[PDB]
Write a protein that binds this ligand. Structure first.
Ligand SMILES: Cc1cc2nc3c(=O)[nH]c(=O)nc-3n(C[C@H](O)[C@H](O)[C@H](O)COP(=O)(O)OP(=O)(O)OC[C@H]3O[C@@H](n4cnc5c(N)ncnc54)[C@H](O)[C@@H]3O)c2cc1C
Length: 498
């Protein structure tokens, strides 16, 4: 049937948009292809942990996988599973695997909670058409508050065994003249203290994050989406995947929407129509919908920039072997708290999170997820044969990212007389994982495929809201930027268009 506004997806862009639409009195339906994660599973928990993965860990795979970096210790817990509507989806393209959340809340379900504002001078470089004063004066603060960002207590951090891994890398980086920064988070750090004291059920301190957190983490279902539902003007339908978008003959948009069960069985195909259509299906999902619509003739006026300008936020993973006298600890909080900020906007820039490892025994490994400045971009190209977008990115396009990460970590190795690990990412000697992405950015870039507020070029009342708007790189963990940009966009769209 018809609803005034439809929002596709329930990640950051979608959640912001729906809240503000509902507050404006616009009846809004959100369509989410994954589950509402609120049913206790076979262990009494909603989500599986990293040491006990089961079908809930994976979107339609037949075997669980170890978190990247952890195969040497966590392959032993891998098991065959039924293909199921689980929470984490590794999407495999030719030479890149992109990890995304599937469920009410999108990537907020599976992410590390790290809530980081980009450097203003870098924001100004990547998005020169956007007024940066309103972003920093109004929209970043708005996002910060709504997301429930909080800050770790420094004394507790310094003292606790759960962050020894972070302190070890801080000391090692310091010998190379590199400083660290605390990383704000949406995981409740007060709750985390009480986990360590045995006062509340553990989540971060029980090797949970990437398949969800049963406690502590303020994912979007608890923040923006709960508020959106609270308006009385928003509903969310789950296990509903939008497949096609067209402009109807009488105006507005019509969607074909597949309803499935958690086993992936097709239950129904529905036609849903609306006046205002907001895409929040992510960098991958929104871009796929639009290249499909262009190339199958259902939105024939979409421009040539739809699909273009994708990058992996310069994501590279690497690891160092510590000296025997610098163990990182058997007990590592699953939520990072420290990063190495070596980002000055030059081509050598690196902002690296000091990543915990889940092994639960001493390995002497320090793990890092580097964010780099690499100008290479890929393009999503629709394949009509399979009805899927393909990502034209080649592994050699990550060479500048590897080079920047390696230059930084080489400084740390030189200062400390340490070497890389070469065995964490497969049998072949490989110190730098260069074909994964947790932070997909672009495909429907702001000002290129859209106007400066995400209005899709060629169409009225058609909006993109999410990571597909960002031109490939933000220099930091991206969700705060996506959220703040979505606050800016929806406020303007409601004022001018609704
Ligand atoms: C392992 C991991 C760790 C991360 N850690 C951090 C971190 O600590 N901090 C940070 O800033 N970022 C982090 N990120 C990145 C962050 O989670 C993403 O940048 C963010 O979630 C993107 O928001 P979005 O709104 O673009 O899309 P998403 O959050 O990906 O949401 C898109 C939603 O749309 C749904 N959907 C897609 N297609 C359709 C369709 N056709 N029909 C219906 N529904 C659809 C999806 O199922 C999903 O729920 C991490 C991500 C991962 C995977």
């Amino acid at each position: 049937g018809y609803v005034p506004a439809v929002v596709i997806g329930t990640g950051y862009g979608a959640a912001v948009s729906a809240l503000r639409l509902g507050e404006a009195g616009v009846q809004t339906l959100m369509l989410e292809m994954g589950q509402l994660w609120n049913q206790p599973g076979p262990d009494g928990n909603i989500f599986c942990g990293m040491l006990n993965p089961d079908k809930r860990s994976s979107w339609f795979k037949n075997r669980t996988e170890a978190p990247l970096g952890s195969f040497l210790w966590l392959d032993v817990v891998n098991r065959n599973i039924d293909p199921y509507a689980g929470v984490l989806d590794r999407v495999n393209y030719d030479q890149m695997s992109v990890y995304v959340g599937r469920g009410v809340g999108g990537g907020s379900l599976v992410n590390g909670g790290m809530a980081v504002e980009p450097k203003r001078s870098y924001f100004e470089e990547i998005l020169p058409r956007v007024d940066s004063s309103e972003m920093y004066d109004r929209y970043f603060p708005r996002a910060n508050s709504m997301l429930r960002v909080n800050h770790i207590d420094t004394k507790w951090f310094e003292d606790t065994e759960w962050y020894k891994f972070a302190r070890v890398s801080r000391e090692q980086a310091g010998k190379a003249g590199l400083g660290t920064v605390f990383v704000p988070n949406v995981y409740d750090f007060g709750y985390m203290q009480r986990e360590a004291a045995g006062e509340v059920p553990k989540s971060a301190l029980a090797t949970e994050v990437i398949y969800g957190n049963n406690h502590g983490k303020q994912s979007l279902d608890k923040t923006y989406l709960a508020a959106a539902l609270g308006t009385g003007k928003v509903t969310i339908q789950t296990l509903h995947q939008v497949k096609t978008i067209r402009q109807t003959k009488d105006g507005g948009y019509a969607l074909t929407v597949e309803q499935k069960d958690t086993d992936g069985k097709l239950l129904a195909t529905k036609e849903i129509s609306c006046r205002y259509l907001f895409l929040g299906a992510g960098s991958l999902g929104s871009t796929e919908l639009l290249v499909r619509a262009r190339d199958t003739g259902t939105l024939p006026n979409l421009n040539s920039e739809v699909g273009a300008g994708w990058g992996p936020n310069g994501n590279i993973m690497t690891a160092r072997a510590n000296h025997m006298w610098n163990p990182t600890g058997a007990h590592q909080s699953s939520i990072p708290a420290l990063g190495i900020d070596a980002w000055d906007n030059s081509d050598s820039s690196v902002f690296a999170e000091i990543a915990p490892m889940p092994a639960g025994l001493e390995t002497w490994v320090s793990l890092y997820l580097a964010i780099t400045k690499n100008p290479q971009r890929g393009t999503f190209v629709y394949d009509a044969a399979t009805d899927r977008a393909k990502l034209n990115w080649t592994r050699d396009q990550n060479a500048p990212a590897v080079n920047a990460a390696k230059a930084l970590f080489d400084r740390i190795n030189k200062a400390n007389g340490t070497i890389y690990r070469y065995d964490l990412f497969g049998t072949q000697l490989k110190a730098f994982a260069d074909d994964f992405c947790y932070h997909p950015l672009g495909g429907c870039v702001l000002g290129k495929a859209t106007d400066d507020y995400g209005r899709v070029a060629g169409y009225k009342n058609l909006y993109v809201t999410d990571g597909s708007l960002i031109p490939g790189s933000v220099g930091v963990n991206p969700f705060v930027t996506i959220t703040a940009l979505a606050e800016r966009n929806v406020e303007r769209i409601i004022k001018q268009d609704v």
